[PDB]
Structures are given as structure tokens and as C-alpha cells.
Symmetry: C2
Subunit: 49 residues, 2 copies
């Protein structure tokens, strides 16, 4: 009965870790998206000059 | 004795999910580095022309 309580302490810490690292993955994902159209219009930009 | 075995199934999947996400976020993270100098050198470039 003690070790599944220590395991309870153990899995709660990492489902929350998953729910901060996945938030980081999402936070970086729209940065990936925003930089994708950023390099697109700069490649177009120097072409015209 | 049943449910800490079902918990064992749960935690093994969840640490591997963390380890797959960790290699994905690292795979993204070095391309953060590559796109950081990619935007940089074109600022220098269209400026010169």
C-alpha cells in the first residue's frame, strides 16, 4: 500500500510535466508557423530588387 | 495487487510518450537554431542591393 502512493506522487508529477512540455510544443508550433510565412515573403522580397 | 500492475502499464507508456516527445522537441529545437541564422543573413543581403 505504500509504493502505489509513491507511484501516485510519481505519475502526478509527470502528467503535469507532459502538460507543460506539450504546452511548450504548442507554443513553439505557432512560432514555426509564423516563421514559415516570414521566410516566404523575404525570398520574394530580394527577387524584385 | 491488480491495479498497480495496470498502473505499471500506464507509467511505461507515459515515460515512452515523454521520451518520444523529448526527441521530437529536440528535433524541432535544432531547426530553431538553423532558421535563426536563415532570417539573419538575408537582412544583410537585401540591405546591400
Amino acid at each position: 500500500n505504500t509504493l502505489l502512493k509513491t507511484e501516485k506522487e510519481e505519475l502526478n508529477r509527470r502528467i503535469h510535466d507532459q502538460a507543460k512540455e506539450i504546452t511548450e510544443t504548442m507554443e513553439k508550433k505557432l512560432v514555426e508557423e509564423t516563421k514559415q510565412l516570414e521566410l516566404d515573403l523575404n525570398d520574394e522580397r530580394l527577387r524584385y530588387q
